[PDB]
């Protein structure tokens, strides 16, 4: 299309509206109610431009640029006097009731309303009357509510209800008393309620965890990191002040997690700021815990390891690729053990084999929203991979999108699209042991044990393709539901099958692979998504190694007299008694970790490793994309006694001190080169980010904004002399404002978004090639593998149906977004949000055992009797007891295990 803005000709996309087209050209139009991910509604009336009928026209007409298509031969003006006057008047009308609150408001310096008040040029107040006032509500531990600052732009309700599918936030009231919030005081129930603090252009919804230790945006030190709380790998901007991690903001990635995070990633960072974290290397001598610096710790550990006869290393999916590879190099390839159990490793390797050898294209997180039918097998996506559940909701609304596009309704006219596609939606079929949070939009839900869900998947694959193995013993009603699912999936242009390792069953993954292969054999555009558990579970699966049971066997048998545990608590993947006995039998335990774990009481040496905020590295997310995360701040800048290094740096220095009796720490690119040279499967991690010599016209990339303050006073209480600026030899970023953060800089890693006049998260519009699209020079992250030329064979291992045996109870896994991830429960703001530790019982089984709801029952697992209160679960099948995975005392390895002597105490 051809448009003419202020007499200047531009080529745009005709399917776009004028606001996003002009913002993609770099032109500045103020806007409040429009969002790139939410569409246009024409509410705030801020984006007014003046449209002319043709080339010669002097009158014009004030039109709404978000509601006006950028058709061919359009003529508009932004800097027209009437348009500028009306935009200033709209800002003035919004500012009539706005409270005098900017000094004590957490959106100050980050406020879109502040930016657009300044940008319209409105600074003189002629309104002399009163301002309307609203009482506030308690929205939970994460979101702070202040309704006085609202401009009634309707972004919160649109996102939370239409986009995120939430049901507890709405708009109430009338003419100028419109209230945006919950119908009563209570926690916001949605798993994506944290994105309200970026969706809201004002300070109505604010990050309360950030508000506890608040600092302004210009005072932050930012880095581009990867969220470490599940396997999705959402791009984040951690921001730091005064030596503590202060906030997690959403960093735009047009391929993964474009504008939105989930609440676990946005509020689960608080384990970084814990005061019990190790800050120095500590050696246990008898009962004393003496403190070493880095060199003496390296020398002593190297000496003791040199006297040992066999040193084994236990990695973890918490640690990055470089840390796991450095441990593997230190202990040897045959002595390296992955930190997960045998069953977890088997499921992880099967999911990896399906992903990179099944011949079916695994989509990115943004690409999930374009699939025409979704089948989720076994995985509770909202509690394990929540952003995938959000993308599934968008893919479900794709049917209404298609129905409106068939009537020549523009794709940004979201209200007309929702009116046309009233309740018609793409088919979603979810299977779980109980109800899921996707059930409000799912076409069907199957509450059944994991064997029965696997049998349902195998039956779907057999009904789609007769060469697939069949399932005998299907009820006629279940067969009717099976053929409903099959007719929905076969008629879909782009079917998507989502499974994962969290179901605790190999057969569920096999059934999902069979369904994907059967859909591929019919010529469909099938995609498959596998949800892993931890941040680098795919990386540890690709690198591979022995299971934790083999490492414990080597420690118990005495064949290994030294164990190096890297970033692992060892209790989520094995029984605590066995781990404690094996570690007590080992004459040397050496734990390299950044969180105070329970296995350090018997550890002979403890290395204070760095968390993701204080380390650089690479992680592989669930889709097989390698992504680099960068250090946010130097932990030794404020406390000079703090010796906290990267895990790969620690282990490479230990290997050097063991071999040549000398200390060499590393550079990060050296470890990256070692990984891509010795492991050809991980050879794609080199292109995840450029090396430390990458420059933008000769200068590095700035971590903090150019108006970063307090440089000569923030450390003045320790010493009046300003210290050396910290040197970052590992990466291309500098720990200072002396760098480049231009929107037009030829780079992909953006630590934070800021443009002059755009201080809010709307500066990402300046950082993109087109608004709502990708980054200008591509998104960071490179897929490790392409899709295979040939697929796998059908999995013939069809399990039998679940038989409830007497005296035993099958443990059904229950996952929580707040509580199941290991590092997130350590965050003290999560204890107000994590549910009470329950045990889920079927009503028939609870009546058989004579237990009501809330009474305490005691069960013994691995000879350890623990007691939990009973919650009645209607959807849980009998013979199963439901346990909350990843909580205190309940390892996630317990999924699918049998429970004995479950009896009321």
């Amino acid at each position: 299309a051809t448009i003419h803005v202020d007499g200047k000709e531009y080529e745009v996309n005709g399917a776009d509206n004028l606001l996003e087209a002009c913002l993609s050209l770099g032109l500045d139009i103020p806007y409040f109610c429009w969002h790139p991910a939410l569409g246009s509604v024409g509410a705030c009336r801020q984006c007014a431009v003046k449209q002319y009928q043709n080339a010669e026209d002097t009158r014009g007409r004030l039109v709404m640029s978000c509601m006006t298509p950028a058709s061919d031969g359009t003529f508009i003006s932004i800097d027209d006097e009437e348009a500028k006057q009306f935009r200033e008047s709209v800002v003035e009308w919004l500012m009539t009731n706005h409270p005098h609150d900017c000094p004590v408001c957490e959106e100050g310096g980050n406020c879109h309303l502040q930016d657009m008040t300044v940008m319209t040029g409105h600074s003189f107040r002629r309104y002399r009357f009163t301002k309307r006032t609203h009482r506030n509500q308690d929205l939970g531990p994460f979101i702070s509510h202040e309704m006085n600052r609202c401009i009634a732009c309707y972004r919160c309700v649109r996102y939370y209800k239409d986009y995120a599918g939430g049901t507890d936030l709405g708009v109430y009231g009338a003419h100028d008393n419109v209230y945006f919030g919950r119908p009563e005081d209570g926690t916001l129930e949605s798993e994506f309620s944290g994105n309200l603090v970026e969706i809201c252009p004002t300070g109505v919804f604010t990050d309360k965890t950030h508000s506890e230790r608040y600092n302004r945006k210009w005072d932050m030190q930012f880095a581009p990191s990867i969220c470490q709380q599940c396997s999705i790998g959402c791009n984040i901007s951690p921001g730091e002040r005064y030596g503590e991690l202060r906030r997690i903001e959403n960093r735009y990635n047009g391929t993964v997690n474009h504008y939105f995070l989930c609440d676990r990633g946005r509020f689960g960072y608080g384990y970084v700021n814990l005061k019990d974290r190790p800050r120095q290397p500590v050696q246990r001598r008898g009962d004393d815990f003496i403190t070493l610096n880095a060199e003496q710790a390296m020398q002593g550990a190297a000496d003791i390891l040199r006297q040992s006869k066999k040193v084994i290393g236990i990695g973890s999916p918490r640690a990055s690729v470089e840390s796991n590879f450095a441990l593997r190099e230190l202990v040897g390839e045959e002595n390296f053990y992955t930190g997960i159990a045998h069953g977890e490793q088997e499921r992880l390797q099967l999911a990896l084999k399906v992903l990179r050898e099944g011949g079916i294209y695994t989509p990115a997180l943004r690409e999930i929203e374009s699939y025409d039918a979704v089948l989720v097998l076994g995985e509770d996506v909202t509690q394990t991979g929540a952003r995938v559940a959000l993308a599934v909701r968008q893919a479900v609304k794709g049917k209404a999108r298609e129905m409106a596009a068939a009537q020549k309704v523009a794709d940004w006219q979201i209200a007309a699209i929702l009116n046309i596609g009233q309740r018609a939606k793409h088919p979603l079929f979810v299977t779980n042991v109980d109800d899921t949070r996707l059930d409000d939009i799912a076409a069907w839900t199957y509450r059944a044990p994991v064997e029965d869900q696997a049998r349902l998947g195998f039956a779907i694959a057999h009904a789609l393709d007769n060469s697939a193995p069949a399932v005998d013993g299907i009820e006629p009603e279940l067969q009717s539901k099976i053929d409903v699912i099959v007719q929905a999936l076969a008629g879909a242009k782009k079917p998507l099958i989502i499974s994962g390792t969290n179901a605790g069953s190999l057969e569920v993954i096999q059934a999902a692979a069979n369904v994907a292969k059967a859909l591929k054999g019919r010529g469909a555009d099938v995609g498959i998504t596998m949800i892993a558990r931890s941040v680098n579970s795919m990386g540890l699966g690709i690198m591979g190694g022995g299971s934790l049971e083999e490492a414990l066997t080597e420690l118990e048998t005495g064949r290994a007299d030294a164990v190096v545990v890297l970033e692992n608590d060892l209790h989520r993947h094995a029984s605590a008694t066995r781990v404690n006995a094996a570690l007590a039998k080992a004459p040397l335990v050496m734990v390299v970790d950044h969180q105070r774990t329970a296995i350090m009481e018997n550890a002979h040496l403890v290395l204070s490793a760095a968390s993701f905020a204080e380390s650089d590295g690479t992680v592989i997310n669930n889709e097989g994309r390698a992504q680099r995360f960068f250090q946010v701040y130097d932990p030794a800048y404020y406390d000079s006694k703090t010796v906290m290094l990267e895990s790969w740096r620690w282990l490479h220095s230990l290997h050097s001190t063991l071999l040549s009796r000398e200390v060499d720490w590393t550079q990060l690119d050296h470890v990256i080169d070692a990984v891509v040279a010795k492991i050809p499967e991980l050879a794609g991690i080199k292109d995840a980010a450029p090396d430390a010599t990458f420059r933008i016209r000769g200068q590095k990339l700035a971590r903090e904004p150019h108006r970063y303050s307090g440089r000569t006073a923030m450390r003045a209480n320790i010493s009046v002399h300003e210290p050396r600026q910290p040197q970052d030899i590992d990466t291309m970023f500098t720990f200072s404002m002396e760098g480049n953060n231009q929107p037009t800089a030829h780079r992909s890693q953006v630590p934070f978004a800021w443009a002059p006049g755009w201080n809010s998260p709307q500066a990402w519009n300046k950082f993109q090639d087109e608004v709502g699209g990708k980054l200008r020079f591509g998104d960071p992250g490179v897929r490790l593998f392409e899709t295979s030329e040939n697929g796998l064979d059908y999995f013939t291992s069809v399990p039998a149906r679940f038989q409830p045996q007497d005296g035993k109870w099958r443990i059904a896994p229950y996952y929580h977004l707040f509580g199941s991830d290991e590092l997130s429960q350590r965050a003290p703001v999560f204890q107000s949000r994590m549910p009470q530790p329950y045990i889920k019982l079927n009503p028939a089984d609870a009546a058989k055992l004579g237990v009501n709801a809330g009474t305490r029952v005691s069960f013994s697992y691995d000879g350890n009797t623990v007691t939990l209160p009973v919650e009645i679960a209607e959807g849980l099948t009998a013979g199963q007891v439901g346990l909350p995975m990843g909580m205190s005392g309940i390892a996630p390895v317990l999924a699918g295990a049998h429970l004995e002597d479950l009896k009321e105490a």
Binding site: G42, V171, Q407, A415, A416, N419, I420, Q422
Partner: protein, 148 residues
């Protein structure tokens, strides 16, 4: 009308099924706007909708919907019973047919009459409303309600 066969199923044997309902509102002026009327009919807050698309293409519950005033649908049966030629010859004006006009507010006869289009406002005030009341002198007038 339902018990006499004018409504329901098979009206006058032609096979056309028509069901008529009465939906009482809950007191809001914006509900008279036809897109806000549709939104209120759907049980939502009566915020209007951006047009295009118009309600005739996708209106109530996404279906073709026609919103019309009471007086238009009261003018319809006379057109269908007496013909187009009669209705076009009621008045010699651009606006065809009769309109319910009337003057209100401190007049001798505040009321409502049916007059052909093109009737001047002085005739409605003087010949029909009786003019202004005793002791009151005419100052201004609004032709079509509070929004004029």
């Amino acid at each position: 009308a339902t018990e006499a066969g004018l409504l329901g199923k098979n009206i006058m044997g032609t096979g056309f099924d028509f069901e008529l309902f009465v939906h009482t509102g809950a007191g809001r002026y914006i509900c008279g706007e036809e897109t806000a009327l549709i939104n209120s009919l759907e049980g939502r807050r009566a915020n209007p909708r951006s047009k295009p698309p118009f309600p005739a293409t996708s209106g109530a519950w996404g279906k073709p919907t026609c919103v019309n005033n009471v007086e238009t649908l009261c003018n319809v049966p006379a057109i269908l019973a007496n013909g187009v030629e009669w209705y076009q010859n009621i008045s010699k004006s651009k606006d065809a047919g009769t309109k319910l006009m009337g003057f209100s507010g401190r007049v001798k006869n505040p009321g409502l009459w049916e007059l052909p289009f093109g009737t001047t406002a002085r005739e409605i005030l003087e010949d029909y409303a009786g003019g202004m009341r005793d002791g009151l002198k005419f100052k201004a007038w609004q032709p079509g309600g509070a929004g004029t």
